[PDB]
Design a protein around this ligand. Structure first.
Ligand SMILES: COc1cc(N2CCOCC2)ccc1NC(=O)c1cnc(-c2cccnc2)s1
Ligand SMILES: COc1cc(N2CCOCC2)ccc1NC(=O)c1cnc(-c2cccnc2)s1
Lengths: 268, 276
C-alpha cells in the first residue's frame, strides 16, 4: 500500500471541501464522504468516514479485504490514513448510480454499455465469492466506472468471509446469496433507470415492480428506461429474467454468481 | 391510566418474595421472561396475579406508557386484562390477571412435563388468538410482537394476547417489517409462524436445527422434499389430516413474502372456522 498523511490528504482535497464539484468544491458523493484529491499530476478518490468503533471495524475490514482481493473489476485501494481516510484510484465516469440518473448533464448510458457493465459487475462479485468473501453492500452507488466504463466494485466496509437487502439478510443471516439478491436490484436499476427506492413512487421499492409485472399490472415495457435507443426486447427480457431469479425470496432458489455470469454472457 | 390501579412497588416486592428469580417449580416466583422483563407470580387482595417487572430507560418507559395506553382502549375476550401498574419505586411494573395455563409457548414445549395440547385445543387456541388480533386491527392497532410466548391461556385454554409494549395505532417478522414498515399485514405474517408452531410443536427458531427458522419449512414442503406429515407434532393423537392440512394452508398464505398477497385477519378467521 501507500501511506498518506492525514495532513497531506487534507491539503490535496482543499481541506476536505464538502461543497459539490459542481460548485468548485471537492465532494463527489456521500453515503462516509468521498472527495476528489489531487496528488502531483494525478487524481485520486479519498473517502473519509463519519458508533465510532463500528466505523473502525469497517475501516479495518475494508483494508483487510483490499489487501487480499485485487482484480480488474474491483476498485484499487492505493492507501490509507490514520478521522479515518481511504484512498482509491480515481474513476472518471463516477458511479453507476450517477450515470443512470444522468447527473452533471452526462449522456444516458446505452443498452450496449449497460450490458457490459452488468457483466463486469458480476465478474467482480464472482472474484469475491471465489475467494470466500461476501460483499454485503452491493448497490449502484458502489459500482464505479473507469475511463472505458468498465465496472468496478467498491466499498468493502461490511465485507466478511435497505432497498437492496434480501429477506434473510434483514433477518441477520450472512450469505453470499444475499450479494446475488442485491445484484438483482442493481440489474433492475440498469433496466429502468429508476432509483432503488423512491418515497413518492408506487411501489416505493424498485424490487417490488417484480410483483407488478408478475400480476400483469405492469409490463417490462412499462418500466424500461425510455432514454436509450438500442435496447432490443429480447436481451432486455433476458436481463430481466436474470434479475427476477436473483430476487427470489429464498436464498436456495437464487442462482449463484457463476450461473449469473453465464446468463449475462448468453444475453449478448 | 385512570381505569387501572396504582400499586406500591414495596407491596409488589412483598408479594413476590422480593421478586424471587428462581422458577415456580423450585419455590421461587419467576414464571417467565424475555420481552423487556421478567414475569413473576404475585398476589393482590389474596388473589394470584402476574407481575411483569420491566428491565435504554426512556424507551422502556415509553413502552411502559404505551402498554398502559393500549390496555385502556382494548378489552376483549382474547386479550389479557391489565389490573394496574407501579412506577413509584425502583422499577416499573405491570400487573395482569393471572393466566393459569401459562403461555402457548410453554404448553407447546411441554414445560415442566405438562401434557401435550390436543389438536382440538390447538384449534380453539388458534381461533381465539385470531379473534384477539381481529379486535386489535378493527380498532386500528398493530401489535408488532405476535409470538407464541405472548399468547396466554386461562383455565379453559382460552387464548389471550398480550405484550402491547410495541403496539402502534426476528423469527416472527415479515420482510417489510424488518425494513421498518409498520403494517397490520405484518401481524398476519407473525401469526403464520405461530400457526406453524401449533402444527409442529417446534420453536420458531432453533440455532441447532435445519432449517434454523421454522418459516423455512414452507419452502421445504413446497419442494416436496418434505411433507406436512413429516413436520406434524407427533404428540397428539387426535389430529386429523384434513384439518391439519387446512391449518397449514392458512399458515402458508399468512407467510407470503409480499404483504398485499396475505389474507387480512377476517379472512384468516373465516379460513380457521372452515377448518372446524
Ligand atoms: C461518486 O464517486 C465519483 C464521482 C465522480 N464524478 C465524476 C463526474 O463529476 C462529478 C463526480 C468521479 C469519481 C467518483 N468516485 C471514485 O473515483 C471512487 C473510487 N473508490 C470509491 C468508493 C466509493 C464508495 C465507497 N467506497 C469507495 S469512489
Ligand atoms: C409465562 O407466563 C405464565 C406462566 C405460568 N406458569 C404456570 C405453570 O407454572 C409455571 C408458570 C402462569 C402464568 C403465566 N402468565 C400470566 O399469568 C400472564 C398475564 N399477563 C402476561 C404477560 C406475559 C408476557 C408479556 N406481557 C404480559 S403473563
Amino acid at each position: 500500500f501507500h501511506s498518506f498523511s492525514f495532513y497531506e490528504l487534507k491539503n490535496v482535497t482543499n481541506n476536505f471541501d464538502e461543497r459539490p464539484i459542481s460548485v468548485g468544491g471537492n465532494k463527489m458523493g456521500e453515503g462516509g464522504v468521498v472527495y476528489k484529491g489531487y496528488v502531483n499530476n494525478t487524481t485520486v478518490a479519498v473517502k473519509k468516514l463519519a458508533t465510532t468503533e463500528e466505523l473502525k471495524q469497517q475501516f479495518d475490514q475494508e483494508i483487510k479485504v483490499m489487501a487480499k482481493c485485487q482484480h480488474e473489476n474491483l476498485v484499487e485501494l492505493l492507501g490509507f490514513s490514520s478521522d479515518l481516510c481511504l484512498v482509491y484510484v480515481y474513476m472518471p465516469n463516477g458511479s453507476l448510480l450517477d450515470r443512470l440518473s444522468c447527473l452533471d448533464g452526462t449522456p444516458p448510458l446505452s443498452w450496449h454499455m449497460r450490458c457490459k457493465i452488468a457483466q463486469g459487475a458480476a465478474n467482480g462479485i464472482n472474484f469475491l465469492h471465489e475467494n470466500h468473501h461476501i460483499h454485503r453492500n452491493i448497490k449502484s452507488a458502489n459500482i464505479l466506472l473507469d475511463e472505458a466504463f468498465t465496472a468496478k466494485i467498491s466499498d468493502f466496509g461490511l465485507a466478511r468471509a435497505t432497498a437492496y437487502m434480501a429477506p434473510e439478510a434483514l433477518r441477520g443471516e450472512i450469505t453470499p446469496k444475499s450479494d446475488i439478491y442485491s445484484f438483482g436490484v442493481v440489474l433492475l436499476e440498469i433496466i429502468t433507470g429508476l432509483p432503488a427506492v423512491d418515497e413518492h413512487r408506487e411501489p416505493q421499492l424498485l424490487l417490488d415492480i417484480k410483483e407488478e409485472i408478475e400480476d400483469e399490472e405492469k409490463t417490462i415495457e412499462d418500466y424500461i428506461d425510455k432514454k436509450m435507443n438500442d435496447a432490443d426486447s429480447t436481451s432486455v427480457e433476458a436481463m430481466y429474467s436474470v434479475a427476477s431469479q436473483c430476487l427470489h425470496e429464498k436464498k436456495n432458489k437464487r442462482p449463484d454468481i457463476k450461473k449469473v455470469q453465464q446468463l449475462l454472457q448468453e444475453m449478448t
